[PDB]
Amino acid sequence: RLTELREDIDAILEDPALEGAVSGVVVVDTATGEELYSRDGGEQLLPASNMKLFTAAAALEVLGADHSFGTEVAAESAPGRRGEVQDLYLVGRGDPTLSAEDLDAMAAEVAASGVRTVRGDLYADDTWFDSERLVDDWWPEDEPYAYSAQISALTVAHGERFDTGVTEVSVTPAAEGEPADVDLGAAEGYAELDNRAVTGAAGSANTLVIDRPVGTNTIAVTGSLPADAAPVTALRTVDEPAALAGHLFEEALESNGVTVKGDVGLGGVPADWQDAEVLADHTSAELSEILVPFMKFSNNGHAEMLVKSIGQETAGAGTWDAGLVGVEEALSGLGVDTAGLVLNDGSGLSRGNLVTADTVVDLLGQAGSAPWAQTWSASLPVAGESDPFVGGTLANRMRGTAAEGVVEAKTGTMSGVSALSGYVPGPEGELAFSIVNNGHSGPAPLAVQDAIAVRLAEYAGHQAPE
């Protein structure tokens, strides 16, 4: 029975899609610790987004399932009879899920506290983290896209997925020959527009490009939207997430009757304030809840914020340097052997990251008997599950197969790197597996990843639902 399985997995790895590819494959029955499969379990490989497994584990260890994040508004002193304060400070402390609406709720609190005029400047304070926005080796041609958003302590999160530091751009065709209409979303009056996009003849070719040219804050739109095309929308990153948080907050104060006479800028709360008057605050949901939209959709912004939050917890330094030492420690503390790990970021985006697959499986072991096991395993995408907040990055994979509704795993794909790692729970035993692929040159071996995962779910004692 165990011998049959071993051969099958051999055959699934004969796939011509894994040509020129090193491939780490490890499976461990978790109730015994018996190794069911190993091939190159100790080869170091880029993990892409599976690196998040490591980050998420550390965040629960260091910050707690119970941990929550805060944002505050501060003046040097409370307002008086005339309802005047000088400078105002929006201070964010690494909340990954802060909305425009939470900003509006805070704006109303500022109004309900009796401020009617900010006479000075409004300052965006994100100094709870350092201002290194990007990891060193992340690719500049990549910076305009959501998963590559700049990192900050004070970032406005968009939508129910809480994609941070981005705005939504919408492009609507007009009459043929006229400029397309461009809508910059949140970032209106913040980010510059360069619109060269035009409406083309009805049923012509869509050639629309939406860019943020490197090292600018300008949204350059080019190409031709067909008169009859549906409205196009895209999430693009902005430069300086906090500053936009600031912008959006002035707008909210205006909408809540509180006038600003000054400027909106980056600024830290001065040291020489004696006892700041906190005029408004917001608390995020708890980590265990935030884990869900982070892990299901693989949120890179969240990953890195989390790392910088670990560096604040273990050292009081919202820094990649400190947080990464933080994660390594936490994993070690977990009983994980971190010899093969090289940690260069929390999202997996960096090509300096390295893992081995024994290591990943190891992590899955330890995190499995952890006090916070259920909140951990509940954040993993569940194969074939159509509801986006259950399925996640596995929603439209392994449908109609024994894997559907059972296999919980994290995904991870970029050029030449793909990974799948997680649990196959079943009647037989709760299995834990890791599949990491490097070298391959065509499409990502998702078929292969699937084949294995589906075999395991059967080995564990599941049948395809029909």
Ligand SMILES: *B(*)CNC(=O)Cc1ccccc1
């Ligand atoms: B974690 C699931 N995400 C992805 O597969 C997209 C991604 C993100 C970061 C690194 C590689 C791939």
Ligand SMILES: [Mg+2]
């Ligand atoms: Mg605006």
Ligand SMILES: [Mg+2]
């Ligand atoms: Mg089943």
